[PDB]
């Protein structure tokens, strides 16, 4: 069977009902499904075995149900420790997973840009850092433009986890180039796009 889970990003406020989905289409009806919770740096912990049976030590708020191909894991009230990734398993098949996320008001990123340091230029490598600080939701499109030309394949990005205080995300976007390529252009910018808004922070290489 093939297991599919949705939504993979279920953003809900603490204290409200959370409903998850698992579709075992490539199976008969084998009500031999299971549910797991995994936290970063930890192994998965069994929550539901069978269609609806709770595993030992699992609080009452966790429960499961199913009908043929569609199965649901429901948490009646979201505790602070319930915001994690969840997987469903049938025999040896695993779903792609569902991440439960704290829901908060929309926050615009604080866009900062850092030119390559003079020390790094001496080694023949240039790195330009685009910083997105304390925004929400996690979705955001960062595009590098060098002399008003969109770049492709020469940048990488990483995202921090939800901050423990304000439940926001921070995204880094590093543009990696050579010294020769960095010296042949003046204007460098990253365009952050989020919800009909496109903030573009730029600089000139000299100056």
């Amino acid at each position: 069977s093939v297991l599919t889970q949705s939504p993979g990003t279920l953003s809900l406020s603490p204290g409200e009902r959370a409903t998850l989905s698992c579709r075992a289409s490539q199976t008969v009806g084998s009500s031999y499904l299971a549910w797991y919770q995994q936290k970063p740096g930890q192994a998965p912990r069994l929550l539901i075995y069978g269609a609806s049976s709770r595993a030992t030590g699992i609080p009452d708020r966790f429960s499961g149900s199913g009908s043929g191909t569609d199965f649901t894991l429901t948490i009646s009230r979201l505790e602070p420790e319930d915001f994690a990734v969840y997987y469903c398993q049938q025999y040896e098949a695993f779903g792609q997973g569902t991440k439960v996320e704290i829901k908060r008001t929309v926050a615009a990123p604080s866009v900062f840009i850092f030119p390559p340091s003079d020390e790094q230029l001496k080694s023949g490598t240039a790195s330009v850092v685009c910083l997105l600080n304390n925004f929400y939701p996690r979705e955001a499109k960062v595009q590098w433009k060098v002399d008003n030309a969109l770049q492709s394949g020469n940048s990488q990005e990483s995202v921090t986890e939800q901050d423990s205080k304000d439940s926001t995300y921070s995204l880094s976007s590093t543009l990696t180039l050579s010294k020769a390529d960095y010296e042949k252009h003046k204007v460098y910018a990253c365009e952050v796009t989020q919800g009909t808004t496109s903030v573009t922070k730029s600089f000139n290489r000299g100056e």
């Binding site: 595993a55 604080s110 600080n133 921070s170």
Partner: protein, 225 residues
């Protein structure tokens, strides 16, 4: 009731790695031993199981011909050997024990090991190169200044970054490392501080790379532009 595994290992591409999983607190031969790996950021991937009694395993078709699962009933330790390691074989390898089931469906993994980190890379250990993210007019927006450090070209994981020897913790974001095309990890740590304190307070990032026994302290001096 516990499942201890072997320590993390690093192997070159094309080599082989063997991971142990010793069982405690239960009868080893009464339950099968399954192996499930998880790539960084991906989901769970079932590999195979092995019968402790007879020793006859069953592998997934993806790993067939590359995985050998054995066991030692004397010490209650199960083994998993993967050969022909590829760059995409970097994953955390767990061992899971299915529980006794009323319907004899021995696939409900209630006991898990802490996992074994297996990293496959053609790179050699290198010290991190730390560069300053100097605050300037391009990072000062209405009384708030942004500065940081770029930890680039280091191998292997992990590194630990602090600020002001741990005295500065508010508004500090250390990003997860990204694997560059050169095979070297590269991350960056940032912090937002009042722009009034740029000319008075000193800010130093503390990058520690225990695998290379290198500890770099970098002072971020503000720019004037």
């Amino acid at each position: 009731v516990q499942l201890v595994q072997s320590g993390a290992e690093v192997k070159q591409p094309g080599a082989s790695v063997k991971v142990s999983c010793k069982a405690s607190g239960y009868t080893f031969s009464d339950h099968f031993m399954h192996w499930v790996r998880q790539a960084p950021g991906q989901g769970l991937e079932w590999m195979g199981w092995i019968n402790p009694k007879s020793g006859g395993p069953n592998y997934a078709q993806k790993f067939q011909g590359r995985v050998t699962m054995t066991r030692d009933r004397s010490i209650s330790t199960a083994y998993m050997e993967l050969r022909g390691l590829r760059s995409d074989d970097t994953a955390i390898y767990y061992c899971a024990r299915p529980m006794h089931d009323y319907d004899d469906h021995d696939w409900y993994f209630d006991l898990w090991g802490r996992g074994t980190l297996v990293t496959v890379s053609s790179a050699s250990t290198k010290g991190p190169s730390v560069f300053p993210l100097a605050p300037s007019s391009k990072s000062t927006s209405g009384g708030t200044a942004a500065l940081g450090c770029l930890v680039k070209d280091y191998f292997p994981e992990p590194v630990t970054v602090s600020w002001n020897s741990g005295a500065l913790t508010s508004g500090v974001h250390t990003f997860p490392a990204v694997l560059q095309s050169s095979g070297l990890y590269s991350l960056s740590s940032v912090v937002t501080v009042p722009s009034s304190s740029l000319g008075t307070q000193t800010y130093i990032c503390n990058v520690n790379h225990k695998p290379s026994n290198t500890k770099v302290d970098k002072r971020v001096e503000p720019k004037s532009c």
